[PDB]
Structures are given as structure tokens and as C-alpha cells.
Write a protein that binds this ligand. Sequence first.
Ligand code: HEM
Length: 148
Amino acid sequence: RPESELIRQSWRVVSRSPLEHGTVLFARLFALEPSLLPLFQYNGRQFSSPEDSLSSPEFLDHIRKVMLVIDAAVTNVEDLSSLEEYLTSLGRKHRAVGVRLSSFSTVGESLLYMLEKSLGPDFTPATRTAWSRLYGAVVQAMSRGWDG
Ligand code: HEM
């Protein structure tokens, strides 16, 4: 697929520095939707502000987790059923911690935001469409996790 190659190529530089990039993605996410901030709780405490999340080892480690799973999706772009069971299991864990399917779109926009800002003129229309379809396939796999 030419499309799988657009994804792989655009992901290369991001994957070289996954935390700095996931940091953009989550900074965006909490700028768009600060009501997601209390979902991330460690030691029991609640992050008061988005910048508080960026000081938390548990939260930074969470970011690297997320970026590893997107990397996995990229690795498997050509099939992506090879990941479906993992992703459905990921979906279940989300439903169990109280996330709602409606939040998926804001995360997708945060991802696409981070990619546009990283790539600039290399984030071609074709690249964006490819990413939107990949993210949508990942979401559709995870959504199963809300099946029961
Ligand atoms: C619907 C929008 C989403 C919200 C609101 C959300 C929120 C969360 C929260 C609150 C946690 C648990 C945090 C913790 O206790 O440390 C989590 C875990 C995680 N998220 Fe998301 N998430 C969303 C979508 C996604 C997407 C699209 C992916 C990537 C495919 C993803 C990847 C992960 C991973 C890998 C974990 C760790 C799961 C584990 O520990 O087993 N999430 N997410």
C-alpha cells in the first residue's frame, strides 16, 4: 500500500522521540478538553492544571505507553487484525476506567494535531487522510471493548 508507506514514513521522526511527541499530543488533549484531566490519577491525587500532569512520572510513563501502542498500529498498518484482540482488550480497560466512546474523536484530533505540527509541509492531504483512516480502524477495534 502506498498509504501504509505514507503512515510509516510520517511516523519515523515521531518515533525517534516518542515522549516529546506524546507530550504535544497530551498537552493538546487537555487544552481541548480539560475535563479529561481528572481521569489520570496517581497516589490518588488529581492534577489541578495540565502542566501538573507533565511533572508526573506515572503520567509521562503513561504517555510512552500510548505512543508504543500507536507505534504497534503503525508496525501493523498493512493488516491491523493482527492487533484486533489486543486493541479490544485495550478497549475494555478504557470502558472499565470510565472513558466514553465520544472522547475518541478528541484524542484523534490531538494525534492529528501533533502529526501536523511535527511534519509541517510533509503532513500532506494524503498523509492526513491515511492517519485518519488508521486512527479510525484502531478506534473501531477498541470500540469492541464496549461490547460486554
Ligand atoms: C477515548 C479517548 C481516550 C481517553 C479519554 C483515554 C484515557 C485513558 C486513561 C484515563 C487511561 C488510564 C490512565 C492511568 O490510570 O494511568 C488510559 C490508558 C491507556 N490508553 Fe487511553 N484514552 C483514550 C484513547 C486511547 C487511544 C486511542 C489509545 C491508543 C490506541 C490509548 C492508549 C492507551 C494505553 C496503551 C493505556 C495503558 C493501558 C493499560 O495500562 O493497560 N488510549 N487511557
